[PDB]
Each structure stands twice: as C-alpha cells, then as structure tokens.
Amino acid sequence: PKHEFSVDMTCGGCAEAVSRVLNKLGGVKYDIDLPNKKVCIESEHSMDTLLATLKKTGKTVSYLGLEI
Amino acid sequence: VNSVTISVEGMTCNSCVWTIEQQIGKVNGVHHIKVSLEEKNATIIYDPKLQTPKTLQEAIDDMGFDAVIHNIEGR
Ligand SMILES: [Cu+2]
Ligand SMILES: [Cu+2]
Ligand SMILES: [Pt+2]
Ligand SMILES: [Pt+2]
C-alpha cells in the first residue's frame, strides 16, 4: 500500500522533521521529495494515522490519494 | 514562572525556528519562547503548575526535531 501526501516543506530542515515523525511511527518505508513538497508512504498503517503522524510537524498536510 | 533551555538538533533555516516557535507558543502555560539557530536551542519561560521541562521537551521532540533538556532555571 502506497499512500501519497502533500506536506508544505520550505527548507531541508523541514524535510528532516518529516522523516523523523515517520521513523518513530515505525513500520514505514518513505520517500520525501522536498522540491515538489510531497511524501509517499508505503505502510500497513491506516491513512488516518499516517496522516496524523505527519501533522505533528506543525506543517499543513493533506491526502492526495494513492499511486499505488 | 520558571525557565527551561532545551537544545534542538535539526534546525536549519528560519522556517524551522518559526515552526517550533509558533506552535510551542500556542501551548498553554508557555509565557514566552525564544528559539536560537546559533546555539541551536529554545528558551521557554513558563507557568510551572501547567507544564514541566519534560512536557516542553517532548512537545518539541514530537515535531521531528531532537530535543534534550540542558538547563532548568527557577526560584
Ligand atoms: Cu524547516
Ligand atoms: Cu529551516
Ligand atoms: Pt531553508
Ligand atoms: Pt512510492
């Protein structure tokens, strides 16, 4: 399962925070595009928790659907 | 009110300080927060029957920046 999120990421430090909340939820394999302000997560975790994880950054997130 | 200094790895630009500053400020009991890129930390004045150095630390840690407590100051 490969969900895809929009995350407003200004700086490279902003992208480092996204990979941390993700690494602490565990059980994900992610790839963070900083130019395009996008995250794709392959994870058995529900869309709603993976969503919930990414707004702990303080950054406004949103669900784009699947790839997959 | 007391003062904690949490050190913070992973702040690169101002969007980082701002993010950290503007949301840890929304937290209640927080009288005042001033984050510094240079020594890579935040100083928080706060009402102690509302927050603890560990609650403030953890709040930052949950944002994806690595926060560890450096200095507690009070009376
Ligand atoms: Cu940033
Ligand atoms: Cu930054
Ligand atoms: Pt930047
Ligand atoms: Pt992918």
Side-chain angles (χ1 to χ4, degrees):
Chain A
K2 243 199 192 180
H3 314 62
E4 274 248 4
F5 300 84
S6 188
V7 193
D8 70 280
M9 287 182 295
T10 290
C11 172
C14 289
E16 283 161 24
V18 163
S19 73
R20 289 262 309 141
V21 306
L22 281 176
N23 176 66
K24 293 190 249 188
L25 184 80
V28 303
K29 253 152 188 206
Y30 55 82
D31 173 71
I32 310 167
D33 185 312
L34 174 52
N36 278 265
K37 282 172 206 174
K38 265 145 179 81
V39 186
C40 79
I41 315 158
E42 176 175 310
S43 183
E44 297 173 18
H45 298 304
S46 54
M47 186 269 289
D48 296 337
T49 42
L50 287 176
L51 174 95
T53 298
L54 295 148
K55 324 92 163 179
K56 297 173 171 186
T57 57
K59 302 295 189 154
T60 82
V61 196
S62 63
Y63 182 60
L64 307 175
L66 307 84
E67 291 309 283
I68 311 203
Chain B
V1 309
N2 283 10
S3 191
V4 69
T5 314
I6 324 161
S7 47
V8 191
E9 294 316 313
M11 309 188 301
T12 62
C13 286
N14 283 358
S15 321
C16 287
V17 172
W18 169 243
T19 322
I20 301 180
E21 247 162 17
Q22 254 287 296
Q23 157 156 339
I24 303 289
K26 188 192 324 283
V27 170
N28 166 218
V30 178
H31 271 233
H32 180 47
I33 177 185
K34 153 216 168 271
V35 192
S36 148
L37 213 160
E38 293 64 2
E39 288 96 27
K40 322 193 309 288
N41 60 22
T43 285
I44 317 192
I45 309 300
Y46 61 106
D47 188 310
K49 322 205 167 99
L50 282 141
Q51 302 287 358
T52 169
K54 183 58 188 233
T55 46
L56 290 174
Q57 189 261 19
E58 215 181 313
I60 300 174
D61 209 71
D62 284 67
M63 294 191 80
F65 310 95
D66 277 330
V68 317
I69 300 172
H70 205 333
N71 302 90
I72 305 181
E73 313 205 56
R75 298 89 183 185

PDB file of all heavy atoms in Angstrom, chain B residues 14 18 27-28 48 51-52 54:
ATOM      1  N   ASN B  14      14.964  29.489   8.989  1.00  0.00           N
ATOM      2  CA  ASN B  14      14.056  30.190   9.878  1.00  0.00           C
ATOM      3  C   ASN B  14      12.680  29.555   9.909  1.00  0.00           C
ATOM      4  O   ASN B  14      12.009  29.617  10.942  1.00  0.00           O
ATOM      5  CB  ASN B  14      13.960  31.653   9.457  1.00  0.00           C
ATOM      6  CG  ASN B  14      15.165  32.454   9.878  1.00  0.00           C
ATOM      7  OD1 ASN B  14      16.084  31.936  10.523  1.00  0.00           O
ATOM      8  ND2 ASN B  14      15.175  33.729   9.515  1.00  0.00           N
ATOM      9  N   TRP B  18      10.673  29.338  13.288  1.00  0.00           N
ATOM     10  CA  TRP B  18       9.298  29.817  13.247  1.00  0.00           C
ATOM     11  C   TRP B  18       8.298  28.719  13.582  1.00  0.00           C
ATOM     12  O   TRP B  18       7.400  28.915  14.405  1.00  0.00           O
ATOM     13  CB  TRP B  18       9.031  30.388  11.859  1.00  0.00           C
ATOM     14  CG  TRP B  18       7.612  30.705  11.494  1.00  0.00           C
ATOM     15  CD1 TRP B  18       6.870  30.124  10.498  1.00  0.00           C
ATOM     16  CD2 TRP B  18       6.775  31.703  12.085  1.00  0.00           C
ATOM     17  NE1 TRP B  18       5.620  30.703  10.438  1.00  0.00           N
ATOM     18  CE2 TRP B  18       5.537  31.675  11.403  1.00  0.00           C
ATOM     19  CE3 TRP B  18       6.945  32.608  13.133  1.00  0.00           C
ATOM     20  CZ2 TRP B  18       4.481  32.533  11.732  1.00  0.00           C
ATOM     21  CZ3 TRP B  18       5.902  33.476  13.445  1.00  0.00           C
ATOM     22  CH2 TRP B  18       4.689  33.433  12.744  1.00  0.00           C
ATOM     23  N   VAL B  27       1.038  26.630  22.983  1.00  0.00           N
ATOM     24  CA  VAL B  27       0.847  25.772  24.142  1.00  0.00           C
ATOM     25  C   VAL B  27       0.598  26.630  25.382  1.00  0.00           C
ATOM     26  O   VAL B  27       1.182  27.712  25.541  1.00  0.00           O
ATOM     27  CB  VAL B  27       2.056  24.836  24.307  1.00  0.00           C
ATOM     28  CG1 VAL B  27       1.999  24.112  25.626  1.00  0.00           C
ATOM     29  CG2 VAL B  27       2.082  23.834  23.178  1.00  0.00           C
ATOM     30  N   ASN B  28      -0.298  26.155  26.253  1.00  0.00           N
ATOM     31  CA  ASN B  28      -0.801  26.893  27.407  1.00  0.00           C
ATOM     32  C   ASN B  28       0.084  26.661  28.631  1.00  0.00           C
ATOM     33  O   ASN B  28       0.547  25.549  28.890  1.00  0.00           O
ATOM     34  CB  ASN B  28      -2.240  26.464  27.707  1.00  0.00           C
ATOM     35  CG  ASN B  28      -2.729  26.922  29.073  1.00  0.00           C
ATOM     36  OD1 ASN B  28      -3.447  26.188  29.753  1.00  0.00           O
ATOM     37  ND2 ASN B  28      -2.411  28.163  29.444  1.00  0.00           N
ATOM     38  N   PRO B  48       4.763  26.907  35.955  1.00  0.00           N
ATOM     39  CA  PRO B  48       5.160  25.518  36.245  1.00  0.00           C
ATOM     40  C   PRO B  48       4.051  24.584  36.713  1.00  0.00           C
ATOM     41  O   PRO B  48       4.240  23.361  36.654  1.00  0.00           O
ATOM     42  CB  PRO B  48       6.216  25.685  37.345  1.00  0.00           C
ATOM     43  CG  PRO B  48       6.697  27.131  37.193  1.00  0.00           C
ATOM     44  CD  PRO B  48       5.487  27.886  36.779  1.00  0.00           C
ATOM     45  N   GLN B  51       3.064  23.223  32.872  1.00  0.00           N
ATOM     46  CA  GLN B  51       3.988  22.432  32.066  1.00  0.00           C
ATOM     47  C   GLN B  51       5.240  22.106  32.865  1.00  0.00           C
ATOM     48  O   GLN B  51       5.605  22.808  33.812  1.00  0.00           O
ATOM     49  CB  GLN B  51       4.402  23.150  30.771  1.00  0.00           C
ATOM     50  CG  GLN B  51       3.259  23.540  29.861  1.00  0.00           C
ATOM     51  CD  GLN B  51       2.654  22.354  29.151  1.00  0.00           C
ATOM     52  OE1 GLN B  51       3.111  21.217  29.304  1.00  0.00           O
ATOM     53  NE2 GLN B  51       1.620  22.609  28.363  1.00  0.00           N
ATOM     54  N   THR B  52       5.905  21.029  32.456  1.00  0.00           N
ATOM     55  CA  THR B  52       7.173  20.647  33.046  1.00  0.00           C
ATOM     56  C   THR B  52       8.275  20.663  31.981  1.00  0.00           C
ATOM     57  O   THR B  52       7.985  20.587  30.780  1.00  0.00           O
ATOM     58  CB  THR B  52       7.081  19.259  33.715  1.00  0.00           C
ATOM     59  OG1 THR B  52       8.392  18.791  34.060  1.00  0.00           O
ATOM     60  CG2 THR B  52       6.436  18.239  32.824  1.00  0.00           C
ATOM     61  N   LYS B  54       9.883  18.347  31.102  1.00  0.00           N
ATOM     62  CA  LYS B  54       9.733  17.163  30.283  1.00  0.00           C
ATOM     63  C   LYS B  54       8.555  17.291  29.331  1.00  0.00           C
ATOM     64  O   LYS B  54       8.638  16.793  28.204  1.00  0.00           O
ATOM     65  CB  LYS B  54       9.593  15.918  31.147  1.00  0.00           C
ATOM     66  CG  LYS B  54       9.515  14.641  30.327  1.00  0.00           C
ATOM     67  CD  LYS B  54      10.751  14.467  29.444  1.00  0.00           C
ATOM     68  CE  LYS B  54      10.575  13.294  28.480  1.00  0.00           C
ATOM     69  NZ  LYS B  54      11.700  12.329  28.572  1.00  0.00           N
TER      70      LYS B  54
END
